[PDB]
Amino acid sequence: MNRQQFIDYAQKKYDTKPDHPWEKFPDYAVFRHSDNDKWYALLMDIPAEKIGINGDKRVDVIDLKVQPELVGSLRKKPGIYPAYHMNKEHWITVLLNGPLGAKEIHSLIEDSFQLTRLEHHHHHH
Template identity: 45%
Template sequence: MNRQQLLDHVLHTYQVEPDYPWKKHSDYAVLRHPRHRKWFALVFPLESHKLGLEHGPVVEVMNIKTRPELTGSLRQQQGVYAAYHMNKEHWLSLTLENGLPDSDIIALLDDSFSLTF
């Protein structure tokens, strides 16, 4: 799943358009609940070494909220990492490409939406 496919899914499923609140990081897309404005995801480019990977290309990442009891087992899967720059007990970072299947990414996004509602 690439970034645009993900953002299209979010618009179609939740009727949410991304918010770009930072001038310095104008490509960081915050996905917020329409009513109370809480984040349910953050989509952004990240240097791969910041996820603990070997130096390589910049990767598209999505931070999502997750259930603490699932965090450890989810982090055993390819493309799932301790959350970059977020609470590592409640948030995960997912690489959008070369990681989880699209259906798993969508399921985790749906769960994050529910958890932050």
Template identity: 45%
Template sequence: MRKDVEKYIQKKYGSNPEQLWRSYPNYSVFRHSDNRKWFAIVMDVDSDKIGRPGTERVDIIDVKIDDLMLRDILLQQERFYPGYHMNKRNWITIVLDGTVSFEEICRQIDASFEMTASAGQKKKFRQPKEWIIPANPKYYDIVHAFDTEKIIDWKQGAGIIKGDTVFMYVGAPVSAVMYKCKVIETDIPYDYSDKNLTIKALMKIQLQKRYKPDKFTFEVLKNEYGITAIRGPRGITNSLSLALK
């Protein structure tokens, strides 16, 4: 499993193992290429060094974890231990003997990578998200925007990246979600400003689905999904995501 874990890190994140200690040639550190922060350490240690019976040599991985509640839950499970040779409040050790599934180990590696990553790396590697974004028909004829085109330029919202999904909420007098779109390009330079609107960058969005204006109205969003305001890009709940699909 150690080889599989190291291959996973190298393939997904392009991080190669570094042997930093001459006395410990089997200790491999993985870190970010830009900020140089560690996000995983693969080692082999005696079992009793991590608090389990015996002195047999075992392969382990240390990953960072900032959620103290999740840390406490994991430490109650077999083959999870406080971080070996690391800050035990922020790192956990996982034994690589197959007791913890490869998929679970990869999830913990991904979480450790994200929490130690720079803003640029987080943007590059994060998974696609779904957003509701507002569209004011007073400033743009969004109701008819997709009548002749499947792809349009739109103001880029903070946090939105290529691959994300945006559900366009058209303001009064429509007051409803009308379109589902895929973001196919971002960070297009643009400079516009007036008393109502400032745009610094555009994104290209591609129409995927239309909704009837009486389906996902503001009242439905508020009463059934707890969305009381749509003033800028915002995430959506799992229940609303399922309904929109």
């Protein structure tokens, strides 16, 4: 899967525009819904050695939010490495330059989308 596809896909399904809070990182892109509040989606190129792969070539990865019980299912698939941040089950690093298929990624995102749905609750009774 190429980044151009990810950027066009997000603007197509998430209709969200890229953001870069840190100017020292213009190549970094962050997607978030201000109408949903609470989310995590960042795309950045990190060394292949930072994902556990021996290769020293740089690769493109994106943050994927999943449920604590579906982490084993998604994390079981190869090419997907766990987040190196403080969390792990909440956010999972996915290798776009990996063996992951475009249709396979779309299915996984659909599952994460359910958690990024707008208006989680709003009813007096």
